[PDB]
Amino acid sequence: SDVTVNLGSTKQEIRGFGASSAWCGTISDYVMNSLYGDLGYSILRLRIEEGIGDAWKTGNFSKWSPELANAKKASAKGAIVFASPWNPPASMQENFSKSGDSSAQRLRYDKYTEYAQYLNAYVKYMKDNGVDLYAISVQNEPDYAQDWTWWTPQEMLNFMKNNAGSINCRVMAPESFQFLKNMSDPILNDATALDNMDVLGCHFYGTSVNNMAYPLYQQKSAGKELWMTEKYFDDDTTGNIMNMSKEIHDSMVTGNMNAYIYWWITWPNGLATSSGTIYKRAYVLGQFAKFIRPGYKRVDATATPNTNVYVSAYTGDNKAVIVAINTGTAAVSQKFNFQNGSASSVVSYVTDSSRNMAAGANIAVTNGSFTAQLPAQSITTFVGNA
């Protein structure tokens, strides 16, 4: 069946695509130039380093300098930058007994004010150094915390109502490890908390496709954004290339998300080595990042035109973008039809077992239509002038 791309019917606005510099120390220009320049990543996620301890109170920020350097490289390439904490400084924590386990850690209730000042100090350090942070997160995975700081949904709510309004930046929350709605529902159902939330962040570890849709957020979404802020895939084998291609599609199409941000950069389950090698997974994300620029909008496109074929489409800057994934083991031809606009022609870029965002066949668009071969187990991005 044909794919109909309706350029006149717009869906969510695209904030961007990116990865994280968390625990990467100071990333090289080489790696940032490859990811942020060549592949056009538009978002970088910093980890806020609690190893600073209380020294933030006296203004010695040196332990925050590696992520400042990362932020500056991303920004120079036009990316925005946000930051997530795994823990506050040790002095703000306390143990508590979590179902018989006395080792669990949480933020002291009497520290919520100090913690907001801490978050504000990170924002200001970045600002004084030339990086205006796009958003800052209350906690990374407050609901899978055994190795970090726990927050119940109610604890997160309390901070979001009473504290988060004093933060000098956009506020992101909750970053549930699986996008568990019980973690974000209290924020969305409280008028004050909702006011204090700019970006609803979530992670994909174990999230089923149907659970990527969030009706309550959609009904509450005026003035807000929804980002998938962390996911990784194990390696570059074709199964994971397809798993990753398909999930980004699902985050865009079923999730209606504004952004999809990969986990950390120079690591084996990451996108690169520190000496500048770039993994196939980086190019999978680039099929999105490079061509769908911040400010583009998703538009309606027939999403599953054939077995194992998944398609989404986007417009902006007088360009049309179609991302077509074929998870099948055989190449298939796919016909595409533009409505409410058209393109003179398109160029393609393909990632598969042998190719990394490789230039594809230039294709003429006739009567608003073009047909393409989609290789077996491949993701292809077509770009044309609208």
Q: Which two tokens stand for residue 216?
A: 């309550």
Q: Rounded to whole angstroms, what are the CA distances from 96 to 140, 154, 272, 318? A: 19, 16, 39, 56
Q: Which two tokens stand for residue 41?
A: 């990543």
Between strands 319-326 and 363-364, the pairing is unpaired
Domain range annotation of the chain: 1-14+295-386, 15-294
Name the amino acid, one letter, at 175: E
State how far the Cα of 214 lies from the Cα of 223, in Å rounded to an integer. Answer: 16
CATH 3.30.420.40 fits 1-14+295-386, yes or no: no
List, by residue number, the catalytic residues.
141, 230
Which residues make Cβ contacts (< 8 Å) with residue 289, sequence separation at least 6? 16, 17, 18, 39, 40, 41, 42
CATH 3.30.980.10 fits 15-294, yes or no: no
SS (H, E, C) the chain: CCEEEEEEEEEEECCEEEEECCCCCCCCHHHHHHHHHHCCCCEEEEEECHHHCCHHHHCCCHHHHHHHHHHHHHHHCCCEEEEEECCCCHHHEEEEEECCEEEEEEECHHHHHHHHHHHHHHHHHHHHCCCCCCEEECCCCCCCCCCCEECCHHHHHHHHHHCHHHCCCEEEEEEECCCCHHHHHHHHCCHHHHHHCCEEEEECCCCCHHHHCCHHHHHCCCCCEEEEEECCCCCCCHHHHHHHHHHHHHHHHCCCCCEEEEEECECCCCCECCCCCECHHHHHHHHHHCCCCCCCEEEEECCCCECCEEEEEEEECCEEEEEEEECCCCCEEEEEEEECCCCCEEEEEEEECCEEEEECCCEECECCEEEEEECCCEEEEEEEEC
